Amino acid sequence: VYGLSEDEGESRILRVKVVSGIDLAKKDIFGASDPYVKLSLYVADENRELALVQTKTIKKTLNPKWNEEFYFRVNPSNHRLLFEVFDENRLTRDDFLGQVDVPLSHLPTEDPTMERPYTFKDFLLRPRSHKSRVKGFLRLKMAYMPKNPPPPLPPGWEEKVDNLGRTYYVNHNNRTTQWHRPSLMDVSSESDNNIRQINQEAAHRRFRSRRHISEDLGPLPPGWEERIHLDGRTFYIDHNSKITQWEDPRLQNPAITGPAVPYSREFKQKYDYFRKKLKKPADIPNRFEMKLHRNNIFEESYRRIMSVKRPDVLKARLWIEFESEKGLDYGGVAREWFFLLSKEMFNPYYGLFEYSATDNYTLQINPNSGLCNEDHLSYFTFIGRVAGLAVFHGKLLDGFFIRPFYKMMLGKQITLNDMESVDSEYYNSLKWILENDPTELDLMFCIDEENFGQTYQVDLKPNGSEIMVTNENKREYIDLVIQWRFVNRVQKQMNAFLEGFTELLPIDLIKIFDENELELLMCGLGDVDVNDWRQHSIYKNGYCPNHPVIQWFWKAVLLMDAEKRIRLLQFVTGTSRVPMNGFAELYGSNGPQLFTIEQWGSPEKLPRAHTCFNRLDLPPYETFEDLREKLLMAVENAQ
């Protein structure tokens, strides 16, 4: 009844009713919006906010009908109202749907049940800034019962927006990409020398602190591996599925028997078999001399490597020399080159790669790489050679990618759950269609793409626009949307990348690993500190730092070795790296988000993790021996 009204002085009572929204603008496809109206009563001259309320959110409706009332005790000579229609379902894209500002000097006074019921008034929505697409009208009923510009960026800078809806600033002087808005003062006299150089050294120290995995009569069919346990009885284990057998699967399969030994996914033993399979092809010049300059580490390297006709030359020993450096190749130049070059290759400035929707560290192939760069297919082949060169020589790369990126190299099928790390907004809406009935959304097997402000209609399947999606065909709809959004739009780049990668390593030799272990092959194991990790965790749904289960969980993490802890870190946070400062700066889907442990489900169920919020759903296990048994399975099995 109060409705955040005012009192004292001298004023009148104004009743404002929000009726409905008409033809609200759409931002995401599927028409999935949760509009809500925020009402702010403020003072025009003072620009001071006095009252703020909001209306209940109406989910999945482009024309909602709130039909709610509020009251304010203010004078019509100094106060104004601002009704802003926002969205809830948006995670990365802006959720501003419109705004209307109304004065009070010209509002009629009429108490209810006195005169004829006045109709509903319509107000046109307006954008808050230039980068705000709004459309439609808001429905208001206001009465009085009582008788009684973008700031200029510094030169050499421009503001861009990626396909995920976020805004990042690009500098054309130092060729660097940053998220925070640049300051008016360039101060490019001390910042570069005393911050960039220090940060370069700080990043270089971390890069040297990551240890490689190996720092501790035909071929088998792809995915298989041969090992020798005790008693010397050689056995074969199929990493595809989880089966293992004594018999040789090299077309010597007249009978199927699988007693063997219990499955043991040993990452170290995978690499040892992998290393024994690489070969030096015939006669190669046992040297590879490159004279590179640090300022042009990317252009000079690209010309040299891509000028090699036969890739077999790359397999010889690397001999990298920089100008004015009279040193020796004691692993201090080959590894340095793979670090300096890694910054240029995996740089969103060039448009080849962009950051993911789950954090600001992982990288994904930019779908618009063809527009940004005319030679995108050429560079990705070059990246394939360099990435394939590091694995062959056992070096490390300073670049991490999303999980679906490693699936494509292994040639796996991308499912719905793989889009969680690509487009978070798409993943939530698509998963909603999978569970709930999409009948109310009135979706068709067609898509509407906007190019340069021009809306065009695209048919997912023939006669798509005349086919309605329902509870039966929804799974067909989900797969086509995945193909149209992610798989098909980065397939051309991935094939170009894989062509270069296979020029050094056969693709059948890399399918032994999975999408989690393959990341640690090219990047190397990190240094995860549990003491810092434990101090920066958040417990929800009744869990407390003194809870017996939480004590049992952290005791299990300590017992795990170096490899298992990183796999747990990949399982929850979605990546194998921690921020430079530490675990206090973990980033979620829509900003910073600390590691979270939540009580969920029943004791028999396995733990689940949501990479968007670094959240682990840990069921309340009765005993520590039971918790550790199932925690290891969830980390090792779930990928």
Written in H, E and C, the secondary structure of 402-429 is CHHHHHHHHCCCCCHHHHHHCCHHHHHH
Phi, psi of 390 (to 5 degrees): -65, -40
Q: What's the topology of domain 527-637?
A: Hect, E3 ligase catalytic fold (3.30.2410)
Would you list the domain boundaries of the chain?
12-143, 219-264, 527-637
Q: Look at residue 538 and give its three-state secondary structure.
A: strand
Experimental technique used to determine this entry = cryo-EM
Task: Note the Cα 440 to chain centre separation in Å.
Answer: 29
The one catalytic residue among 372, 523, 544, 612: 612
Amino acid at 463: N
CB burial string 208-237: b at 16+ within 10 A, e below: eebeebeeeeeebebbbbebeeeeeeebbb
Tell me the two tokens of residue 62.
């482009």
Rounded to whole angstroms, the Cα distance separating 37 from 83 reads 6
b/e code 519-545 from CB counts within 10 Å (16+ = b): bbbbbbbbebeeeebbeebebeeebee
Show the tokens assigned to 382.
Answer: 């070059």
Six-digit token string for 626: 């039971």
Residue 564: name the closest of 613, 628, 617, 622 by CA: 628
Exposure string over 284-312, b if 16+ CB within 10 A, otherwise e: eeeebeeebeeeebbebbbeebeeeeebb
Q: Find all residues with CB under 8 Å of 318, minimum gap 6, and list them.
A: 288, 329, 334, 337, 393
Written as six digits, the tokens of 456 are: 């065009």
Is CATH 1.20.1440.230 the classification given to domain 12-143? no
Cα 453–Cα 358–Cα 355 angle in degrees, nearest 5: 60
Which residues fall within 8 angstroms of residue 523, CB to CB, at 6 or more apart?
210, 396, 397, 398, 399, 400, 576, 577
Cα angle value 165/167/170 (rounded, 5°) = 135
Nearest of 507, 340, 522, 367 to residue 449 by alpha carbon: 367
612 belongs to the catalytic site: yes
Cα-trace Rg, the chain: 30
What residues contact residue 94 under an 8 Å CB cut-off, 6+ apart? Answer: 27, 131, 132, 165
Residues 447 and 449: their CA atoms lie apart, in Å, by 6
Closest CA to 341 of 318, 366, 358: 318
Q: 219-264 — its CATH code?
A: 2.20.70.10
Residues 6+ apart with CB under 8 A from 360: 179, 587
Tokens linked to 470? 């329902």
